[PDB]
Amino acid sequence: QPQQVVVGVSGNGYVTRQQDGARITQRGVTHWTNPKSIVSIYFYLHQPTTADLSLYAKGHSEIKVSYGKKGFKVNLQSNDFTKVPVGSIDIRQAGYVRIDLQGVSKSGEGFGEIKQLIADNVTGKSNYVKDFSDYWGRRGPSVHLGYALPEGDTEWFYNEITVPKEGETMHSYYMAAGFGEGYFGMQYNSPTERRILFSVWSPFDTQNPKEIPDDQKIKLLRQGKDVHIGEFGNEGSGGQSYLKYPWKAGNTYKFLMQIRPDGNGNTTYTAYFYATDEKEWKLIASFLRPKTNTWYKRPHSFLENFSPEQGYLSREVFFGNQWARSKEGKWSRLTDATFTHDATASAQVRLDYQGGNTKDNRFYLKMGGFFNESVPMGTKFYCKPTGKEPEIDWEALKQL
Ligand SMILES: [Cl-]
């Protein structure tokens, strides 16, 4: 039987053009002043269906509601929210449906306030952000790749990362060389700042790093030139370091990560970044983690959107030439990757999660942007064991 689908704007809407000219808040669209702004609302349908669209809206305005090339002229004329019919659409294939809103005329300060998109008489199942955090839902589903290590003890992991131009999106974390106790990667933080970030969690479970007993704090051993060192909390706690570095889309950067137990019940974590634009290795930091006795475990990568406002945009990254160096000093090319997704994907509130193979013997991750092909949890991907073995001037690195 056809059914009603109520899509909340706060979890499913985005300002997609002229971002200062409207806003998505906990009640949906507000502060809607600029006729050039576009608001887009996304929800997924499993099968072809018609739908009778309405908005739950208030205002004194004329707006334009669009599904592809089909537009509707819609007046708002209310001081309180009411159901405002728009018109009918024909969804010809499964996938994400995008509904756009644009202001045309207003009698007062703004074009109105839009709380919900309502689709009546819809056949089949749908997926979107409901009964779920609007913050996490709009951030969208992070995705990860885990690389299989050889037998024995690995000390170093090496990975190459390239963010293609089409995958370069502000407020993304492109995490290249993760491990059992932390992360090492690069961020696109603002128009003027990008960071190479390296973080290690304390073994002490707390949200406040100042709660950690002295003997369980992450300890700084080495600090690279121009690197900022601090602590973090609110996601567990530990030590962090970053270098401001203007990395470029389309360039291939290298991440080299050493994890070595000291035999005295600690483990050290040392992160190096190859600044391809300068043709030189940079030290980020070396940190000691107490109460830890491990070699390298769980080499992995991830792709994350950390801004809810950016959830309507995709981001994408390529990972190539993965190598492990054993504690005995032997390099091995890694070939086997396992794809996973985060809890937002698991909740099925966002379906725009993907990863796999490129056509040039790399792996990729892609999420956000409301695409239609997903990849399931645990999918395995493989690359051929080809690629240039790292040639590292070990001694030079030790002197950074
Ligand atoms: Cl920068």
| CA–CA separation, 268 and 258 (whole Å) | 8
Contact between 45 and 30 under an 8 Å Cβ cutoff? The reply is no
Residue written as tokens 């005995």? Answer: 328
| CA–CA separation, 81 and 28 (whole Å) | 12
Task: For residue 164, give both structure tokens.
Answer: 């293609």
Residue 149 DSSP code: P
Which residues does 254 contact at the CB level (< 8 Å), separation at least 6?
158, 159, 160, 161, 273, 274, 276, 390
Residue 179 DSSP code: B
Cα separation values, 190 from 37, 171, 215, 245, 303, Å: 21, 7, 36, 12, 17
| CA–CA separation, 326 and 129 (whole Å) | 45
Cα separation values, 259 from 149, 221, 240, 298, Å: 14, 13, 16, 11
Radius of gyration of the chain measured on its C-alpha atoms? 24
Task: For residue 137, give both structure tokens.
Answer: 């839902």
Contact between 177 and 322 under an 8 Å Cβ cutoff? The reply is no
Residue 376 DSSP code: -
| CB-side neighbour CA atoms (13 Å) of 90 | 3
| CA–CA separation, 24 and 29 (whole Å) | 5
Ligand 1 centroid from CA 191, angstroms? 8
Ligand 1 centroid from CA 304, angstroms? 19
Which of these, 36, 24, 42, lies nearest to 100 by C-alpha position? 42
Cα separation values, 303 from 173, 273, 295, 320, 388, Å: 6, 18, 24, 15, 25
Ligand 1 centroid from CA 31, angstroms? 32
Q: Within the chain, how many helices (H) and strands (E) appear? A: 4, 28
Label residue 167 left, alpha or beta by phi (over 0 means left) and psi (-120 to 50 means alpha): alpha
Which residues does 19 contact at the CB level (< 8 Å), separation at least 6?
37, 309
Ligand 1 centroid from CA 287, angstroms? 23
Ligand 1 centroid from CA 322, angstroms? 26
| CA–CA separation, 22 and 105 (whole Å) | 14
DSSP 3-state of 176? strand
Quoted resolution (Å): 1.4
| CA–CA separation, 102 and 22 (whole Å) | 10
Expt. technique: X-ray
Ligand 1 centroid from CA 100, angstroms? 34
Which residues does 392 contact at the CB level (< 8 Å), separation at least 6?
256, 281
> What residues does each domain of the chain span?
1-131, 132-400
| CA–CA separation, 374 and 26 (whole Å) | 28
Ligand 1 centroid from CA 230, angstroms? 18
| CA–CA separation, 330 and 36 (whole Å) | 59
Contact between 251 and 212 under an 8 Å Cβ cutoff? The reply is no
Ligand 1 centroid from CA 192, angstroms? 6
Task: For residue 154, give both structure tokens.
Answer: 């690995």
